[PDB]
């Protein structure tokens, strides 16, 4: 019983962790570029208005 379940678990965990590591990283990269350019635009906007 143990021998079965332990295996199953190992495979589950490895796939999950590696897939999330692979995807979330680039998703956050994109989000961060968009955040950065928006922040630059807002600073430029405020300084221009003033």
């Amino acid at each position: 019983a143990i021998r079965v379940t332990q295996s199953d678990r190992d495979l589950f965990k490895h796939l999950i962790t590696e897939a999330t590591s692979y995807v979330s990283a680039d998703y956050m990269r994109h989000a961060n570029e968009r955040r950065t350019h928006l922040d630059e635009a807002l600073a430029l906007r405020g300084e221009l208005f003033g």
């Binding site: 928006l38 635009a41 807002l42 405020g46 208005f49």
Partner: protein, 72 residues
Amino acid sequence: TIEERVKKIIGEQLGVKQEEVTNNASFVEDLGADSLDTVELVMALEEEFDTEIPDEEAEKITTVQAAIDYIN
């Protein structure tokens, strides 16, 4: 036209359906656009008609009807 160019901008800046965006559809509650999403929406509205808006008068805009009202 302006009253449909506004929809063109809103749908493609928030990703919501054209049917969803009615005149009285508020961005935050109906369309779900949050702080940064609404900021980008107002920026896109500025770009489409190549105009500029004051900060306070822009932030006062929080609905499709209000959006067109300031646009038209």
